[PDB]
Protein: carbonic anhydrase II
Amino acid sequence: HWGYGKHNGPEHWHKDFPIAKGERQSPVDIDTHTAKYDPSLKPLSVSYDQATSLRILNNGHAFNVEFDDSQDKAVLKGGPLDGTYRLIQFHFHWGSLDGQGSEHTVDKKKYAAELHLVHWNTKYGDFGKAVQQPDGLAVLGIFLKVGSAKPGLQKVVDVLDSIKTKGKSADFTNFDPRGLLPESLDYWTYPGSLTTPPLLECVTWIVLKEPISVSSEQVLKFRKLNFNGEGEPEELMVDNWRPAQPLKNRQIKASFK
Structure:
């Protein structure tokens, strides 16, 4: 089955998921010299004050921090979006080396990692219906660089030894995702897809311009996770990123001059 290994990585995914070669695939390279400022874009509204995290899960590809999405507790609105999008989970993609790990690139620059905060459009009632719609999801993408530690990330780092291997989960309540946001909410936006199978073209991407910093020690603990299950030969969970896909007939818009 699909993964990021020597024989099942991104270049193979099209065989089981033909939409991998579709018209609106993600991630993409963001060319800052051709993305155009769109004055019709409105301020992004990130409302995470009532967010209720529940659990953290190693799913064999990444780890997900999961939220209670049965009410409007943690929502994204504004920006390019119409309506209200509820936070369901976040996860990361990262590298084996600090010079790779992000999915989106900026003028071909790869960051050390990328955080995806996944939200679904409440007009479709549940996540599974939302992913069947072109405007079903909004993903907030945030780049990570290695430098100073991110205090807001340490609770996540802290818990990873308890979910080392595929299939392990742990309680993870009262985590505040506001502590993962940069200062500025300046962003680029374009229409795209999920970056893991099933690669559905249901996402309004909102990629923040300003990266967050994490420390080398924080990243190193991500790189101790395992793709494998308990009792199986160890395969470190690294380089769990899809490379940039063709932009095709899309435009990337900037919220800022």
About this structure: The first helix runs from residue 127 to 130. The chain has one domain: 1-257. The chain has three helices and 15 strands.
